[PDB]
Amino acid sequence: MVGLIWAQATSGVIGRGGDIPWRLPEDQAHFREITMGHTIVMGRRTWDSLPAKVRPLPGRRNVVLSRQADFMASGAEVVGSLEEALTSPETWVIGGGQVYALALPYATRCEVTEVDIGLPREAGDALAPVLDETWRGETGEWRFSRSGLRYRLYSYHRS
Amino acid sequence: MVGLIWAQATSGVIGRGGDIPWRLPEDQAHFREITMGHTIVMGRRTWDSLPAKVRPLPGRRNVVLSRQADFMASGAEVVGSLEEALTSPETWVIGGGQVYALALPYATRCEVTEVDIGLPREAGDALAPVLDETWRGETGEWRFSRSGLRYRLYSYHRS
Amino acid sequence: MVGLIWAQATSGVIGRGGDIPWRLPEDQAHFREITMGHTIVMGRRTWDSLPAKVRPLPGRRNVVLSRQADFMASGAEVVGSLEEALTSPETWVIGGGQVYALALPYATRCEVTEVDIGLPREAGDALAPVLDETWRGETGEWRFSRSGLRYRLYSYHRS
Amino acid sequence: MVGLIWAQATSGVIGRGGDIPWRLPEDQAHFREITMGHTIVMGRRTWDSLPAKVRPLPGRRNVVLSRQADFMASGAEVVGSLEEALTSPETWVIGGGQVYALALPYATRCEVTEVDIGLPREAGDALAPVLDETWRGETGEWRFSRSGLRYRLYSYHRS
Ligand SMILES: NC(=O)C1=CN([C@@H]2O[C@H](COP(=O)(O)OP(=O)(O)OC[C@H]3O[C@@H](n4cnc5c(N)ncnc54)[C@H](OP(=O)(O)O)[C@@H]3O)[C@@H](O)[C@H]2O)C=CC1
Ligand SMILES: NC(=O)C1=CN([C@@H]2O[C@H](COP(=O)(O)OP(=O)(O)OC[C@H]3O[C@@H](n4cnc5c(N)ncnc54)[C@H](OP(=O)(O)O)[C@@H]3O)[C@@H](O)[C@H]2O)C=CC1
Ligand SMILES: NC(=O)C1=CN([C@@H]2O[C@H](COP(=O)(O)OP(=O)(O)OC[C@H]3O[C@@H](n4cnc5c(N)ncnc54)[C@H](OP(=O)(O)O)[C@@H]3O)[C@@H](O)[C@H]2O)C=CC1
Ligand SMILES: NC(=O)C1=CN([C@@H]2O[C@H](COP(=O)(O)OP(=O)(O)OC[C@H]3O[C@@H](n4cnc5c(N)ncnc54)[C@H](OP(=O)(O)O)[C@@H]3O)[C@@H](O)[C@H]2O)C=CC1
Numbered sequence: 001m002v003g004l005i006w007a008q009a010t011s012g013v014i015g016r017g018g019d020i021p022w023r024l025p026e027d028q029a030h031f032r033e034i035t036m037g038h039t040i041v042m043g044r045r046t047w048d049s050l051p052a053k054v055r056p057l058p059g060r061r062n063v064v065l066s067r068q069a070d071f072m073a074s075g076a077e078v079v080g081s082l083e084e085a086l087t088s089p090e091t092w093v094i095g096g097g098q099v100y101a102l103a104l105p106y107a108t109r110c111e112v113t114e115v116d117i118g119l120p121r122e123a124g125d126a127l128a129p130v131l132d133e134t135w136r137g138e139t140g141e142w143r144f145s146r147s148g149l150r151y152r153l154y155s156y157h158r159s
Numbered sequence: 160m161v162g163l164i165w166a167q168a169t170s171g172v173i174g175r176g177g178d179i180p181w182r183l184p185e186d187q188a189h190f191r192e193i194t195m196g197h198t199i200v201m202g203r204r205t206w207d208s209l210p211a212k213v214r215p216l217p218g219r220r221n222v223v224l225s226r227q228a229d230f231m232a233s234g235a236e237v238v239g240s241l242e243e244a245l246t247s248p249e250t251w252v253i254g255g256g257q258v259y260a261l262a263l264p265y266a267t268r269c270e271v272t273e274v275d276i277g278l279p280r281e282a283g284d285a286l287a288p289v290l291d292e293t294w295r296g297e298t299g300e301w302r303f304s305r306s307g308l309r310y311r312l313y314s315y316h317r318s
Numbered sequence: 319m320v321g322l323i324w325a326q327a328t329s330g331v332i333g334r335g336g337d338i339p340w341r342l343p344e345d346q347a348h349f350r351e352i353t354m355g356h357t358i359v360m361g362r363r364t365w366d367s368l369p370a371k372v373r374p375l376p377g378r379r380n381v382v383l384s385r386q387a388d389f390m391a392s393g394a395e396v397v398g399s400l401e402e403a404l405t406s407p408e409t410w411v412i413g414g415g416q417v418y419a420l421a422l423p424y425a426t427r428c429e430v431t432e433v434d435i436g437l438p439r440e441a442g443d444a445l446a447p448v449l450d451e452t453w454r455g456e457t458g459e460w461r462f463s464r465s466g467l468r469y470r471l472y473s474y475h476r477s
Numbered sequence: 478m479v480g481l482i483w484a485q486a487t488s489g490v491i492g493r494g495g496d497i498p499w500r501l502p503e504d505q506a507h508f509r510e511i512t513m514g515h516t517i518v519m520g521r522r523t524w525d526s527l528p529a530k531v532r533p534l535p536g537r538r539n540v541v542l543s544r545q546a547d548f549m550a551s552g553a554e555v556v557g558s559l560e561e562a563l564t565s566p567e568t569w570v571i572g573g574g575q576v577y578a579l580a581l582p583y584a585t586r587c588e589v590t591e592v593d594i595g596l597p598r599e600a601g602d603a604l605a606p607v608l609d610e611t612w613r614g615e616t617g618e619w620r621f622s623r624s625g626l627r628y629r630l631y632s633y634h635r636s
């Protein structure tokens with residue numbers, strides 16, 4: 001099973017200037033609970049954007065995709081291709097517009113957080129993958145972040 | 160398949176003052192059995208620690224990590240990076256607190272010997288890596304050494 | 319008795335870019351009629367959106383909800399929690415999509431103005447709370463303002 | 478009208494370790510049909526034990542009892558006393574041994590699901606209230622669950 005997990009603004013924006021352009025502790029919680037105890041796969045830019053304190057992410061097998069000869073990622077496994085990255089029976093892809101796009105054909109689950117903020121796409125943004133009719137989903141109830149953000153969870157699957 | 164194999168006191172101590180701080184022939188025999196005929200990888204200080212009589216370890220392809228590029232290890236292969244070292248399909252990492260920690264993300268097997276002795280950690284000790292919940296393990300029965308060391312075997316795996 | 323009072327487009331939009339996206343003096347008169355001489359509760363953003371001319375709103379006890387421990391609201395009562403805000407026996411919760419959603423469980427009345435204008439929801443809009451079957455309603459007759467927009471009043475109650 | 482609704486093993490056990498110690502979808506459907514569109518009242522521990530996706534329970538006015546003035550229950554009404562909680566003309570008390578025991582004197586209906594499983598009481602279990610002879614009752618016919626659980630419904634009343 002390969003799953004994708006991401007958080008997006010309604011626009012589809014997931015990253016900008018090497019960071020996630022909102023703060024949502026509830027989503028961090030959600031992400032940790034899905035991914036804990038499992039192999040996680042991320043592109044190297046996502047690895048760079050991890051806060052130093054949680055790089056590598058604790059309690060997970062961190063796998064970092066890089067097309068660069070000897071990229072160094074202390075505490076993670078660096079691999080050079082998707083075939084090498086996607087071999088664990090429960091794999092969560094967490095990381096990168098580029099790596100979402102490339103790994104999606106291998107995926108049978110998506111766990112999506114939608115954040116209800118106005119955030120129009122800009123050139124160079126990292127974007128969420130667009131899901132087609134092969135997928136079926138369930139939509140969760142809208143909620144308010146205990147800070148103020150409105151957000152909701154989606155769970156998609158295909159067989 | 161990259162595997163780790165080590166022997167630790169209950170405390171996690173695997174090395175002190177450049178040597179293993181206990182005597183256990185049965186563990187030596189277990190180590191020999193697992194590693195014979197395979198590629199073994201060790202850090203440079205583990206190489207220095209090998210008794211001269213078995214440096215390099217016979218019947219194994221000895222691979223030594225150093226970032227001293229011109230380092231000389233007669234009878235072994237010296238490499239300067241982890242990716243250079245971990246390319247044999249059955250690889251056993253045998254050697255070093257540091258190299259265990261750095262190689263662990265690449266590993267899907269751990270073969271552990273626990274030695275039931277009181278040996279509290281001291282600053283500068285080499286330590287065994289701590290395994291998180293990505294692993295499943297089987298615990299062997301306690302037994303006594305050729306003399307009276309109580310010891311156990313563990314086998315850990317993840318996929 | 320806690321009540322909510324709001325005006326929405328048919329779409330459910332009540333605010334955009336910090337302002338109410340329509341002009342309707344008849345609604346303003348309805349609002350003052352209902353709230354005059356009572357305690358009103360609003361979120362900080364709604365307080366900020368009040369025209370300076372009527373901030374605080376005259377003839378009502380203005381209560382403002384803020385998570386900012388030090389927030390200043392001259393002429394209003396700043397409180398840090400919902401419990402502290404909803405203590406008056408007749409309380410009218412006035413704007414704020416956030417504060418509407420959070421106060422709704424405490425409420426037994428809703429006084430709603432619906433504005434018949436095409437105004438599709440956009441990301442980050444403030445939205446009216448959606449009312450479930452715990453509520454009973456009464457619908458008022460459609461009418462035109464001297465403006466040019468159709469509106470009508472709803473009155474909702476539960477015990 | 479205050480009613481109690483609960484599901485119990487034959488032994489009286491309704492909760493253990495923060496959860497209901499069985500799965501019975503048919504009971505969930507039964508609970509939903511009785512409580513939908515009404516006020517529901519629950520102790521704080523029952524609130525915590527709700528699956529996050531149905532917290533608060535949809536289509537019902539959720540009321541949570543806590544001896545904490547501070548306590549926060551997003552999407553629910555937190556109250557500090559029984560008198561504050563039981564003021565709706567149709568109230569269903571849904572939760573927890575201690576709120577069952579405390580609210581029972583206010584109640585004139587009980588809707589009970591009995592689950593035919595061997596589940597002896599353990600210290601600290603949450604238990605169903607004991608019904609004395611003030612009540613009259615009707616017993617439903619035994620049914621097998623779609624999973625294979627044997628359960629039946631009881632309806633109790635007093636005036
Ligand atoms: N909101 C969310 O849920 C998340 C948001 N983000 C945001 O996403 C942004 C980063 O996404 P992005 O910029 O697209 O970069 P990625 O994080 O996707 O990593 C991209 C890099 O991974 C390497 N890579 C990708 N695919 C392969 C492959 N198939 N084989 C080998 N190497 C590969 C590439 O190397 P080369 O360039 O050599 O091809 C590329 O440089 C950041 O802003 C981050 O904060 C990150 C994670 C989740
Ligand atoms: N009980 C057991 O099962 C075992 C115990 N031991 C004990 O462990 C101790 C050795 O532990 P340690 O001191 O950690 O020995 P090491 O694993 O540290 O050998 C370390 C060497 O590997 C090279 N190296 C340094 N940084 C990196 C890097 N970032 N990536 C790759 N290679 C690198 C360097 O060689 P250079 O310095 O030349 O650059 C470094 O000094 C000894 O006391 C030994 O007896 C050893 C094996 C098993
Ligand atoms: N059409 C209508 O009927 C009305 C429409 N509106 C529109 O609504 C929009 C603003 O609504 P919205 O954006 O939802 O923000 P709100 O007006 O609901 O106020 C939100 C703020 O309330 C504060 N707060 C403190 N504690 C709490 C708490 N426990 N629960 C909730 N809020 C708390 C925070 O302020 P801090 O950040 O200081 O902590 C938070 O940012 C504006 O566009 C306004 O014009 C406004 C009024 C009526
Ligand atoms: N099988 C079934 O039908 C059901 C089973 N359950 C199970 O029941 C168990 C929980 O029941 P229980 O442990 O008895 O806890 P409760 O759910 O009864 O809630 C107890 C809490 O309610 C608050 N409370 C109780 N009495 C008062 C009062 N008089 N005034 C103010 N606050 C009050 C306190 O909250 P604070 O501590 O914040 O002061 C107290 O800790 C769980 O295992 C749950 O899964 C729950 C519902 C139905």
Ligand SMILES: CCc1nc(N)nc(N)c1C#CCc1cc(-c2ccc(C(=O)O)cc2)ccc1OC
Pocket residue numbers: 005006007019020027028030031032046049050051054057093094095111112113
């Ligand atoms: C929490 C963000 C997130 N949400 C969802 N739904 N899917 C994702 N794939 C990511 C992601 C990511 C990368 C990332 C992780 C984290 C992070 C920090 C701590 C923990 C944890 O303690 O478990 C997890 C993720 C922080 C920042 C960050 O990018 C800047």
Ligand SMILES: CCc1nc(N)nc(N)c1C#CCc1cc(-c2ccc(C(=O)O)cc2)ccc1OC
Pocket residue numbers: 164165166178179186187190191205208209210213216252253254271272
């Ligand atoms: C036997 C020690 C050991 N046990 C386990 N379970 N895992 C390990 N990785 C090592 C190790 C090591 C390094 C080392 C090997 C040996 C050794 C000696 C003989 C043989 C052999 O005959 O095969 C193998 C290793 C001796 C000393 C020594 O450190 C000082």
Ligand SMILES: CCc1nc(N)nc(N)c1C#CCc1cc(-c2ccc(C(=O)O)cc2)ccc1OC
Pocket residue numbers: 323324325336337338345346348349364367368369371372411412413430431
């Ligand atoms: C009159 C708008 C309104 N209608 C209903 N039915 N329910 C509400 N809760 C609000 C409201 C509100 C907050 C608010 C009041 C006003 C307002 C402004 C001016 C005057 C006045 O000058 O008379 C009165 C109210 C303006 C903006 C505004 O949010 C942006």
Ligand SMILES: CCc1nc(N)nc(N)c1C#CCc1cc(-c2ccc(C(=O)O)cc2)ccc1OC
Pocket residue numbers: 482483484496497504505508509523526527528531534570571572589590
């Ligand atoms: C179905 C459980 C139940 N049965 C009966 N006969 N009486 C009760 N009071 C409760 C209860 C309760 C709390 C609770 C509700 C639910 C639940 C989930 C969904 C729905 C729904 O969709 O309506 C309702 C209750 C799930 C778990 C749970 O405790 C762990």
